[PDB]
Amino acid sequence: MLDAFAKVVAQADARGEFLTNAQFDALSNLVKEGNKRLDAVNRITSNASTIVANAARALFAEQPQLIQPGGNAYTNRRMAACLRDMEIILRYVTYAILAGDSSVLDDRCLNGLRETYQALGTPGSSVAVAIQKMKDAAIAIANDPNGITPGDCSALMSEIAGYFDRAAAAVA
Template sequence: MLDAFSRAVVSADSKTAPIGGGELAALRNYVAEGNKRLDAVNAITSNASCIVSDAVTGMICENTGLIQAGGNCYPNRRMAACLRDGEIVLRYVSYALLAGDASVLDDRCLNGLKETYIALGVPLQSAARAVAIMKASSTAHINETNTSGTNPVETRFRKMETVQGDCSALVAEAATYFDRVISGLS
């Protein structure tokens, strides 16, 4: 497993060159934006259960066949497995975002995931759709652009109340990790 710093070291070692100027600038940026990154990870972890259940609910609403007899989210046992897998994917994305590198996601989550799902008969398209919804809501939580939705009396709506700032780079980075999962599943 690598993070942003050890990734720089491994690539410099392959050239047997010390790390200077250009590479250090990127790492200095990681350091300077460190607090934003930690807030972003916190935005995901603090809302994890909301993000996961929302994604699985959305996936089922779009394809109600999943919870009818014979569907892949029927009965509760398989629905629970689905929620658990959503949480696992989100957890590895949060690790990758903390590390600033996708290697932990690749090595420990995506490696063999597609093959496992095919063997178990899990519909890849539905799984990818749930991840796409997690991507949308996670990036909204990081950017604090999440809204209460169409229900006027929504009581579970929550904003993180962190200091406002430009988080576009982190949002884009988090989005690439979700995209990585989606492309790994398709």
């Protein structure tokens, strides 16, 4: 598992170099933008339950074949496993948001997940839909301009979207 700083450090060690002024500037800028990051994490984490619930409801409304007898999300056990999966994906996403790097999401969540869903028979494309829903919702919540010190968070939201899209592409 790596964070942004650890990533730069590892890349520099592979070459056996001290950090250059450019890298010091970049990391310093990352630090200066830490409050926005902590805000995003705090918000998405604070609304995780409603994100997963609303995303699931919307999914099953759009694809009722998943929740009818014979579907993959039929019975309470498989429904619970689906809601659980969504919680996991959102969780490791938030991990990546705090870390500034997708290393933890990849290794501990996305690596080998396409194979799992193929073996079980779960349609990874539906999971991708779910991840898209949770993405839009989470970005809305994190970029809600009410009750916070105004400013520009456009670069952070594109990164969060980067992690979500990364997951969706990983499962689909």
